[PDB]
C-alpha cells in the first residue's frame, strides 16, 4: 500500500487489537476507488488458523446492509413499494395494531416499538405469525426509532415475497452473484468451512446459531475482499449495470427518517459529512445507538448525499464488524474482528484512519 495507508492503518489497529484482546482481525482501506487490505491474528486460535484476505467473519448486523438493498431492488424491481401496509404481503396478519405500519416503518425500525430481538421460543412460520400478531406497539406507526431485529427481519422475509423466490436466493442471484461478491454467504458451504473464522466470547470459540429471521438480520458472512468490494459499490452505485441493483443502492442510502444528527436509510445510516466524530463515536455506543428515540420523517426523503459518512456496526456473540464509507470522497473502510468489542472504539478507530486520509 501508499505507506501513508501502512502507517495510519497500523498506528491505529496494533493499539486497538492489543487494548481490546482480538484474537484476529482484517481491515480494507478504499482509497480513491482502490482496496487495501490488512491483516493480523488468528481466524482459529485452536488449529493456528491465520486471519487471511479469504477468511470469512459473521457480519451480525452489517447483513442489515444487504438487506436493505435486496428491498430497494424490488423497489426497483416494482415488486414493492415502502408505502404498502404490511399486511398487504402478509394477510394473515389481521390484528388491528397493523392497521397503518407500511414496509417503510418495518424496513426502518419506525413501526412503534418492535422488539430488539425475535425471541429464541419463535421457530415456525406459524410461531412468527402468533409473535407478530401478538405484539403490542407501545408508539403510533411513525413516531419513534427502535433499533430493532424483528422489524427490518421482518421487512426483508415480506421484501421478497413478490418474487417467489426465498430470502436466500433473492440474496444471491440479486445482490451477491451481479457484484461477484462470490464468498459472501448466508449459509456456509462445507467446502469454505477451512476458511470460517471461529468467534471467540469469554475465550470460547463460537458461531452464530440459528434463529427467526437470521438470514434477514443478522446472518452474512463475508470476506475483507468482498466486503471491499460491497463498499465500493454503494460508493460508486453508477458503475453497476443492473439497473434495479443500482436504484436499489441509492434508495438504501437515502434518508428517511432523522433523530439528532443522523438519518435512517435501509440497512445503512447516514450523517453529513463532515461529521463531528463524537457524534458518530459517541452515537454508536449501545443504548444510544438501541434506545427509544422520536424520529423527524423525512418528507419526501432526500436522494442519496454524496457528502455524508455512511456506515453501520455489527455483532454476533462472537464478532464485531463496522463498514464506513464516504461517497464524496471515494473513501472507505471495512473492520471485521473475531471477537465483539464496543461499538465506540471502532468507530473511533474508523474515523482515525479516514480522517486521516480524507
Ligand atoms: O450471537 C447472536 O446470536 C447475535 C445475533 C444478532 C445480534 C447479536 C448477536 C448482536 O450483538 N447484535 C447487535 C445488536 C444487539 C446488541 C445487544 C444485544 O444484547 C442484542 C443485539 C448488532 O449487531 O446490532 C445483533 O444484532
Same mark, same amino acid.
Given at each position: ?26 481491515? $480494507? ?9 490488512? *491483516? ?26 444487504? *438487506? ?5 431492488? /424490488?423497489?426497483?424491481?416494482? !415488486? ?11 394477510? !394473515? ?5 397493523? @392497521?397503518?405500519? *407500511? ?15 425475535? #425471541?429464541? !421460543? ?15 406497539? /407501545? ?17 426483508? &422475509?415480506?421484501?421478497? +415475497? ?28 462445507? /467446502? ?22 437470521? $438470514? ?8 475483507? !475482499? ?7 459499490? @454503494? ?5 453497476? @449495470? ?43 455506543? =449501545? +443504548?444510544? &445507538?438501541? &434506545? ?5 420523517? %423525512?418528507?419526501?426523503? *432526500? ?29 472507505? %473502510?471495512?473492520?471485521?474482528? =473475531?471477537? =465483539?468489542?464496543? @461499538? #465506540?472504539?471502532?468507530?473511533? $478507530?474508523?474515523?482515525?484512519?479516514? =480522517? &486521516?486520509?480524507?
Amino acid at each position: 500500500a501508499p505507506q501513508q495507508i501502512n502507517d495510519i492503518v497500523h498506528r491505529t489497529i496494533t493499539p486497538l487489537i492489543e487494548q481490546q484482546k482480538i484474537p484476529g482481525m482484517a481491515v $480494507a482501506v478504499i482509497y480513491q476507488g482502490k482496496p487495501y487490505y490488512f *491483516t493480523w491474528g488468528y481466524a482459529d486460535i485452536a488449529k493456528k488458523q491465520p486471519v487471511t484476505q479469504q477468511t470469512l467473519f459473521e457480519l451480525g448486523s452489517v447483513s442489515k446492509t444487504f *438487506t436493505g438493498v435486496l428491498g430497494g431492488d /424490488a423497489i426497483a424491481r416494482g !415488486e414493492i413499494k415502502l408505502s404498502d401496509p404490511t399486511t398487504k404481503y402478509w394477510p !394473515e396478519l389481521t390484528a388491528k395494531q397493523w @392497521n397503518g405500519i *407500511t414496509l417503510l416503518h418495518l424496513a426502518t425500525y419506525t413501526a412503534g416499538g418492535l422488539p430488539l430481538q425475535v #425471541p429464541d !421460543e419463535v421457530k415456525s412460520s406459524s410461531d412468527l405469525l402468533r409473535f407478530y400478531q401478538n405484539w403490542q406497539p /407501545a408508539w403510533a406507526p411513525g413516531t419513534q426509532r427502535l433499533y430493532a431485529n424483528s422489524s427490518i427481519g421482518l421487512f426483508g &422475509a415480506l421484501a421478497v +415475497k413478490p418474487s417467489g423466490l426465498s430470502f436466500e436466493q433473492a440474496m444471491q442471484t440479486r445482490v451477491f452473484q451481479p457484484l461477484k461478491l462470490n464468498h459472501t454467504w448466508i449459509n456456509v458451504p462445507p /467446502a469454505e468451512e477451512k476458511n470460517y473464522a471461529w468467534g471467540y466470547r469469554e475465550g470460547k470459540a463460537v458461531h452464530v446459531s440459528p434463529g427467526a429471521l437470521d $438470514a434477514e438480520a443478522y446472518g452474512v458472512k463475508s470476506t475483507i !475482499e468482498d466486503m471491499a468490494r460491497w463498499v465500493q459499490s @454503494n460508493l460508486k452505485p453508477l458503475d453497476i @449495470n443492473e439497473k434495479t441493483l443500482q436504484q436499489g443502492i441509492q434508495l438504501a442510502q437515502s434518508r428517511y427518517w432523522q433523530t439528532g444528527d443522523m438519518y435512517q436509510g435501509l440497512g445503512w445510516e447516514m450523517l453529513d459529512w463532515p461529521v463531528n466524530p463524537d457524534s458518530i463515536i459517541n452515537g454508536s455506543d =449501545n +443504548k444510544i &445507538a438501541l &434506545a427509544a428515540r422520536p424520529v423527524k420523517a %423525512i418528507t419526501p426523503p *432526500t436522494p442519496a448525499v454524496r457528502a455524508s459518512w455512511v456506515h453501520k456496526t455489527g455483532a454476533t456473540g462472537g464478532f464485531g464488524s463496522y463498514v464506513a464509507f464516504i461517497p464524496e470522497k471515494e473513501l472507505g %473502510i471495512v473492520m471485521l474482528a =473475531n471477537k =465483539n468489542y464496543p @461499538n #465506540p472504539a471502532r468507530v473511533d $478507530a474508523a474515523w482515525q484512519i479516514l =480522517n &486521516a486520509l480524507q
